[PDB]
Amino acid sequence: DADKLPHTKVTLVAPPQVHPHEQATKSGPKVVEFTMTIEEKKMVIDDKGTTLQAMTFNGSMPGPTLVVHEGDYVQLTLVNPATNAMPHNVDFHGATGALGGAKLTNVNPGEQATLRFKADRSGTFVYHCAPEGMVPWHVVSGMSGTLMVLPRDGLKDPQGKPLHYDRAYTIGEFDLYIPKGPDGKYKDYATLAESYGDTVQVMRTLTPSHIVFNGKVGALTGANALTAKVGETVLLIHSQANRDTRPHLIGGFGDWVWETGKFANPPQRDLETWFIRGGSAGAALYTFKQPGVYAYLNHNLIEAFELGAAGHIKVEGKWNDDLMKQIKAPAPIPR
Amino acid sequence: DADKLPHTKVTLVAPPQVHPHEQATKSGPKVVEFTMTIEEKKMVIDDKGTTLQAMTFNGSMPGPTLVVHEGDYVQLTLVNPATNAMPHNVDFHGATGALGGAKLTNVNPGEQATLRFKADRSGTFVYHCAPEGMVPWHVVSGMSGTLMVLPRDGLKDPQGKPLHYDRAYTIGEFDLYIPKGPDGKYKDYATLAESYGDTVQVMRTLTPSHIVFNGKVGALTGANALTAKVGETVLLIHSQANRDTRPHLIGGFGDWVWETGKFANPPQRDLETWFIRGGSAGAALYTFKQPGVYAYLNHNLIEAFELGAAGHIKVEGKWNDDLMKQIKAPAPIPR
Amino acid sequence: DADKLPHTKVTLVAPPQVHPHEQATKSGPKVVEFTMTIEEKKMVIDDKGTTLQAMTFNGSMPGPTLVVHEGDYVQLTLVNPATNAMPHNVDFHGATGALGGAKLTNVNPGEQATLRFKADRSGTFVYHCAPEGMVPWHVVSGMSGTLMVLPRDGLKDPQGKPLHYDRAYTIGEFDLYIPKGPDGKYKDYATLAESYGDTVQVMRTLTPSHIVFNGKVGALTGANALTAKVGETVLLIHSQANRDTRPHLIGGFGDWVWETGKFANPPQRDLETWFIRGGSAGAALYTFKQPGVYAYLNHNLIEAFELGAAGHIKVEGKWNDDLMKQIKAPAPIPR
Ligand SMILES: [Cu+2]
Ligand SMILES: [Cu+2]
Ligand SMILES: [Cu+2]
Ligand SMILES: [Cu+2]
Ligand SMILES: [Cu+2]
Ligand SMILES: [Cu+2]
Ligand SMILES: [Zn+2]
Ligand SMILES: [Zn+2]
Ligand SMILES: [Zn+2]
Ligand SMILES: [Zn+2]
Ligand SMILES: [Zn+2]
Ligand SMILES: [Zn+2]
């Protein structure tokens, strides 16, 4: 049983990167040890200075992605420093019992706890905070991320053939509910607690003020664009802990997609747009064949371009005229 | 043909239970006879006394689940007593022709009708009222339920192996559109007809005031929690006749899920959250492995916790530390 | 390579028809040449005279469906006449690179351009306009349609058996965001440009004023109902370039459905309601077995009946009492 196995300790890395790991492995099961520390902080979430009284695992939206293999045990130490105001906990969708671990990880400021569970199902799974009586607030304020449980022999196509990625990225998409005052301007709160009531009223409308990748409008653009090269297969992990989304790569595809995120199921191929149910993480593979700056976005184009749910992927390599060619550049219409 | 076969008569039971039935059967096709009686009534739908001018099959939201086997004929007598104000009918998504039967079951108050159709496709299917010119109102006011057509040889996994459940529950999720007056308080109407215009205006906003399981906030909690035991496989049938939802079991999984609800298709496994398209019923199996009180909810957590789309499942049995263990209880952070 | 192959020229036809084409073909790859001309125009979109400052490919919402076979090259000439006010382009979800072709087809009024790309994946794919900085506006104002890339050997069921349709229809579903003035009446704009700011404010609410098939409430009803006969298999192509939808045939099924729209994946069978992710096109086959007027609709019934997302299919042939029979017509309840 779990008390017999070797332990490993993993150092997490900040999104959109994912900590180094193997896909197919000859390793046997391990107890894999992680630690996360909660940070409440005010964050600027758009280009005009709007702030969110935010709550995070490890300082980031999303929290870092934790990667283990099927049959491993996840052993998380969750730290709630005294510098925080609220209690927190963690609910792993990949875990069985005790409301995902929530019932066993209730940490007031100044406390920590350690949870172990068996990661017995392969897939990308949401984890999120879920304190009794204030679950949606802690989720929408930023407290979610992904646990990826890889099959021990790596990813497989519908015919059981091997699949792999060369590079992985993790995108958390956050529907935010920022209140406005009578002047129509977004409210700025001195403390987390003061934002609560007004935010619940906005939540209940079901209309986000902003929908952002990785914590801010344009998080994944400019200097912070994702990167790849022609010939590389990228895994795009997409989590939405509260609300549906519909990822899409402009000028690309989901070559192999697990939209419900569970790797024991066959993936679908050649997707234009896939669907991440609120409360889940999904996974897409794409092998770049053309260089250029791509957009990766939620294809409700209002959600993407107006509300913030879009990033960029800058891809190096050589252009392929067989795949696409400008035959006649824009030029006057003929007489 | 159908005029040759034996008839059976089934007595329906109220949600969340489902009438006794076999899964795999050695029985041949039958004409299976059901009756439902429509009841219009005012219902209290939340903890603060809000009322809905509701419309129901058999007095309940959802209507009872009807269970037959593929190749059976469903023979429904639909009774509209004179104590009701409106005309009604029934549209079975499992039926072929005549707008699901709607065109053939138009019953004014004081009338009844009898419809037969062949249940030639396996699956969970929505049925709902659909009177010409007032379809959405009758649906959102409570007039829907599920027909479950089981394959004759029972449920199968993607490899054709047998699946089964030990206990079945039926959950209908209702997006409600209750109007408010100028004081911001929900309106209470003396009659069904008086609620119509105001309700259509709320409907057109696409924002529900409440989203409830089985007719009321907290319907499936406390004394009315669903129940199971460690080692039991439960089937959770989930219908949403008007609007999408995303079911999830906190601390569990969808072990095998037909999210589109059609059993001739292979199920997906190991789901964290699945998706019920508005206008459909889906089905999930889960074998409990840990005792405790679970939540079963729509994982738009605002919809669940603010608006009402959540229930509880209380599960007896022994805790399994291999699956999950508290390694260190919440305790002060060390120096 | 592509410079070697034969060229063909296709004449497009207006929705809901689809230009003649073969399914399974013994033909080898071709460069298939199409032309589309953009028309900006004011259109009446409902029964009370509401107008949309609309943008279209070829004068229609949706644009025409383009049909090729896997391994063909699509060669589109896109014409933006001088009679238009805005620049436009095209983003084909079926194409690889250059933001779907958008970067290579930027045409100001009075200009045209010609794009070739390899249609290397089978499926129904959205194409839409995507001018830098005004993508959602051009999409929601009507600038989308479908490219259908058929497998060279035709459609296949999950076991590799042949499937086919006898008749194809193309339905584009449009979430519209028409502004109102202080009097609560929809605004009418003298020019396209004047509609922009007010429309963006409505877009940002995420609540459509109207949701229509093929450009107008009731587009596909009355004289313009779709038609079929008992024994015919119809393909229903359903595109939604911006927002999710949930198609359903009342009194029918999706016999075989590719809801994500990609034919190399196995279809699901016996669907009651399927799901088209915003930003995608899907495809359903249904073989009619009963005559009558069907409804084909988005099964958010508010979206369908209140907001406009419904059409009719009028089906000729003989009634089948084995499939459905009125056993007792509506009649008084007995003493
Ligand atoms: Cu928290
Ligand atoms: Cu959860
Ligand atoms: Cu009714
Ligand atoms: Cu229906
Ligand atoms: Cu345009
Ligand atoms: Cu697109
Ligand atoms: Zn140990
Ligand atoms: Zn590779
Ligand atoms: Zn008989
Ligand atoms: Zn059992
Ligand atoms: Zn040539
Ligand atoms: Zn045919």
Query: Which of B124, B34, B115, B118 is CA-nearest to residue B71?
Result: B118
Any domain includes C70: yes
Residue C211's CB is within 10 A of a number of other CB atoms, namely 24
Any domain includes C212: yes
Q: Measure CB to CB from residue B300 to each of A1, A116, A242 and give the nearest one.
A: A242
Work out how many CB contacts closer than 8 A connect A with B: 169
- C264 with C126, same domain: the answer is no
Query: Which of A272, A296, A326, A252 is CA-nearest to residue C126?
Result: A272
- Is A129 annotated among the ligand-binding residues? yes
Tokens of A208: 């986000």
Cross-strand partners of B240: B280
Using a CB–CB cut-off of 8 Å, the residues of C that contact B are 207, 244, 246, 248, 250-253, 259, 268-275, 289-290, 292, 294-295, 299-307, 319-320, 322-333
- Is C111 annotated among the ligand-binding residues? no
C302–B140 C-beta distance less than 8 A: yes
- Whether residue B210 lies in the annotated active site: no
Indicate the SS3 state at residue C140. helix
Q: Measure CB to CB from residue A99 to each of B251, B268, B330 and give the nearest one.
A: B251
Tokens of A76: 């998380």
The answer to whether the beta carbons of residues C97 and A323 sit under 8 Å apart is: yes
Nearest CA in chain C to B114: C328
* Distance of residue A301 Cα from the nearest chain C Cα, in angstroms: 5
Query: Which of C139, C137, C112 is CA-nearest to residue C192?
Result: C137
Give rounded-to-5 percent helix, strand, coil for chain C. Answer: 10, 40, 45
* Distance of residue A85 Cα from the nearest chain C Cα, in angstroms: 33
B278–C272 C-beta distance less than 8 A: no
| CA angle in degrees (0–180, nearest 5) for B300-C261-A263 | 60
C275–A273 C-beta distance less than 8 A: no
* Distance of residue A93 Cα from the nearest chain C Cα, in angstroms: 24
Distance C252 CA to ligand 9 centre (A): 25
Residue A31's CB is within 10 A of a number of other CB atoms, namely 20
Residue B335's CB is within 10 A of a number of other CB atoms, namely 3
Q: Which chains touch C (3 or more CB pairs under 8 A)?
A: A, B
Residue C283's CB is within 10 A of a number of other CB atoms, namely 29
Sign of CA dihedral B35, B38, B44, B50: positive
Any domain includes C326: no
Any domain includes C99: yes
Out of B55, B143, B148, B203, pick the active-site residue.
Answer: B143
- Whether residue B299 lies in the annotated active site: yes
Q: Which ligand is nearest to the CA of B229?
A: 10
- End-to-end C-alpha distance for chain B, whole angstroms: 81
Residues of A carrying an active site annotation: 88, 91, 93, 128-129, 138, 143, 248, 272-273, 299
Instruction: Find the domain containing A270 and state its range.
Output: 152-318
- B105 with B161, same domain: the answer is no
- Is B122 annotated among the ligand-binding residues? no
Report the structure determination method.
X-ray
Distance B299 CA to ligand 2 centre (A): 6
Nearest CA in chain B to A205: B207
Work out how many CB contacts closer than 8 A connect B with C: 169
Out of B46, B248, B259, B303, pick the active-site residue.
Answer: B248
Q: How far apart are CA B229 and CA B40, in angstroms?
A: 37
A295–C99 C-beta distance less than 8 A: yes
- Is C244 annotated among the ligand-binding residues? no
- Whether residue B129 lies in the annotated active site: yes
Work out how many CB contacts closer than 8 A connect A with C: 169
C97–A289 C-beta distance less than 8 A: yes
Distance C287 CA to ligand 12 centre (A): 8
- C97 with C174, same domain: the answer is no
SS3 per residue for chain A: CCCCCCEEECCCCCCCCCCCCCCCCCCCCCEEEEEEEEEEEEEECCCCCCEEEEEEECCECCCCCEEEECCCEEEEEEEECCCCCCCECCEECCCCCHHHHHHHCCECCCEEEEEEEECCCCEEEEEECCCCCCHHHHHHCCCEEEEEEECCCCEECCCCCEECCCEEEEEEEEEECCCECCCCCECCCCCHHHHHHHHHHHHHHCCCCEEEECCCCCCCCHHHCEEEECCCEEEEEEEECCCCECEEECCCCEEEEECCCCCCCCCEEEECECCECCCEEEEEEEECCCCEEEEEEECCHHHHHHCCCEEEEEEECCCCCCCEEEEEEEEECCC
Maximal C-alpha separation, chain A: 82
- B132 with B1, same domain: the answer is yes
Sign of CA dihedral A173, A181, A197, A54: positive
The answer to whether the beta carbons of residues A54 and A88 sit under 8 Å apart is: no
- The H-or-E segment that residue B145 falls in is strand B144-150
Question: For residue B302, which amino acid is it?
Answer: I
Distance A234 CA to ligand 8 centre (A): 8
Residues of B in contact with C328 (CB under 8 A): 77, 112-114
- B12 with B86, same domain: the answer is yes
Q: Which ligand is nearest to the CA of C167?
A: 12
* Distance of residue C118 Cα from the nearest chain B Cα, in angstroms: 33
Q: Which chains touch B (3 or more CB pairs under 8 A)?
A: A, C
- C183 with C51, same domain: the answer is no
- Is B21 annotated among the ligand-binding residues? no
Residues whose CB is under 5 A from ligand 1 (ion)? A 88, 129, 138, 143
Q: How far apart are CA B170 and CA A159, in angstroms?
A: 35
**b/e per residue B98-112 (b: at least 16 CB within 10 A):** bbbbbbbbbbebebb
| CA angle in degrees (0–180, nearest 5) for B262-B266-B268 | 100
| CA angle in degrees (0–180, nearest 5) for A110-A115-A117 | 165
Give whole-number Cα distances, C124 to A310, C117, C216, C249, in Å.
Answer: 24, 16, 23, 19
Nearest CA in chain B to C306: B204
Q: What's the gap between Cα C32 and its chain centre?
A: 21
What lies within 8 Å, CB to CB, of B119 at 6+ separation is B68, B69, B70, B71, B72, B73, B74, B94, B95, B147, B149
* Distance of residue A16 Cα from the nearest chain B Cα, in angstroms: 23
- B21 with B167, same domain: the answer is no
Q: Measure CB to CB from residue C327 to each of B97, B115, B241 and give the nearest one.
A: B115
Any domain includes B333: no
Q: How far apart are CA C165 and CA C98, in angstroms?
A: 34
Tokens of B145: 């339920």
Tokens of C264: 């190399």
Residues of C in contact with A302 (CB under 8 A): 136, 140, 203-204, 206, 242
Q: Measure CB to CB from residue B96 to each of C252, C274, C327 and give the nearest one.
A: C252
- Is B166 annotated among the ligand-binding residues? yes
SS3 per residue for A19-48: CCCCCCCCCCCCEEEEEEEEEEEEEECCCC
Any domain includes C35: yes
* Residue-wise DSSP of B17-59: S-----SS------EEEEEEEEEEEEEE-STT--EEEEEEETT
B99–C295 C-beta distance less than 8 A: yes
Sign of CA dihedral C180, C186, C187, C192: positive
SS3 per residue for C142-183: CCEEEEEEECCCCEECCCCCEECCCEEEEEEEEEECCCECCC
Q: What's the gap between Cα A79 and its chain centre?
A: 21
- B168 with B142, same domain: the answer is no
- Whether residue B36 lies in the annotated active site: no
Last residue of a domain, one of A151, A178, A205: A151
- A55 with A176, same domain: the answer is no
SS3 per residue for A122-155: CEEEEEECCCCCCHHHHHHCCCEEEEEEECCCCE
Cross-strand partners of C273: C248
Q: Which ligand is nearest to the CA of A84?
A: 1
The answer to whether the beta carbons of residues C217 and C308 sit under 8 Å apart is: yes
Tokens 């009507």, residue located = C142
Nearest CA in chain C to B116: C325
User: Strand A144-150's sheet: what is its strand order?
Assistant: A66-69, A144-150, A123-128, A91-92
- End-to-end C-alpha distance for chain A, whole angstroms: 81
- Domain CATH number, residue A193: 2.60.40.420
Any domain includes A326: no
What lies within 8 Å, CB to CB, of C11 at 6+ separation is C19
Q: How far apart are CA C273 and CA C251, in angstroms?
A: 11
- A177 with A308, same domain: the answer is yes
Distance B227 CA to ligand 3 centre (A): 32
Maximal C-alpha separation, chain B: 82
Tokens of B136: 């959405």
Any domain includes A303: yes
Residue C31's CB is within 10 A of a number of other CB atoms, namely 20
Q: How far apart are CA B252 and CA C245, in angstroms?
A: 29
* Residue-wise DSSP of C6-70: PEEE-----TTS-----SS------EEEEEEEEEEEEEE-STT--EEEEEEETTBSSPPPEEEET
- C252 with C164, same domain: the answer is yes
Plot region of B99 (φ>0 → left; ψ -120 to 50 → alpha; else → beta): left
The answer to whether the beta carbons of residues B327 and A115 sit under 8 Å apart is: yes
Residue A22's CB is within 10 A of a number of other CB atoms, namely 12
DSSP E strands in C70-143: the ranges are 73-80, 91-92, 111-118, 123-128
The answer to whether the beta carbons of residues C113 and A329 sit under 8 Å apart is: yes
- Is B239 annotated among the ligand-binding residues? no
The answer to whether the beta carbons of residues C101 and C77 sit under 8 Å apart is: no
- B107 with B212, same domain: the answer is no
A268–C279 C-beta distance less than 8 A: no
Tokens of A321: 């005229």
Cross-strand partners of B32: B8, B74
- DSSP assignment letter at B306: I
Residue B133's CB is within 10 A of a number of other CB atoms, namely 6
Q: What's the total number of domains in chain C?
A: 2
